[PDB]
Ligand binder design. Structure first.
Ligand code: W1Y
Length: 168
């Protein structure tokens, strides 16, 4: 069984670990607990194919820039999670995109664009802009909602699907 080494990168205000816990024990945590180092492995059946999902959560602060670069090489799938309530994370995606290519040296790399906090009425990021931007990058965009649990499971499925596509 192949282990999929994925890294959940994001800024402060998106709630990265919130999605992970939903996949593990299906619990939506409201509190913001700053993670330092944790890896969650689980056996997920992707379209009938059981795969080992190794997802590591990162820090929202750019304090460990060197540490970020370290596992930026090992990370196969990059989760571009931004928040529609935080326009800053939207612009940060451009920075991460370039940084990823800077350590991968490839015009094509398994990546996914997902927007979280889509349950908040305070929308600062336009859905069209997010969709159009996704087309500009050429990656699938999944609307994720941690509160109503929408675009969560399907996001993981599409993720692995793209990885398999790029692979073979
Ligand atoms: C960096 N120390 C070894 C190690 C363990 N795990 N991963 C890892 C897991 C998922 C995605 C990317 C990397 C790296």
């Amino acid at each position: 069984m192949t282990e999929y080494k994925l890294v959940v990168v994001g800024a402060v205000g998106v709630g990265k670990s919130a999605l992970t816990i939903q996949l593990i024990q299906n619990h939506f945590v409201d509190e913001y607990d700053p993670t330092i180092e944790d890896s969650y492995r689980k056996q997920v059946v992707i379209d009938g194919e059981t795969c080992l999902l190794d997802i590591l959560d990162t820090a929202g602060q750019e304090e460990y820039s060197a540490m970020r670069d370290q596992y930026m090489r090992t990370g196969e799938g990059f989760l571009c999670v931004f928040a529609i309530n935080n326009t800053k994370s939207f612009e940060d995606i451009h920075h991460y995109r370039e940084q990823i290519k800077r350590v991968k040296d490839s015009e094509d790399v398994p990546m996914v664009l997902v927007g979280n906090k889509s349950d908040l009425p305070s929308r600062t990021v336009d859905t069209k802009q997010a969709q159009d931007l996704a087309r500009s990058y050429g990656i699938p965009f999944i609307e994720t909602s941690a509160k109503t649990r929408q675009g969560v499971d399907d996001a993981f499925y599409t993720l692995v699907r793209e990885i398999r596509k790029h692979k073979e």
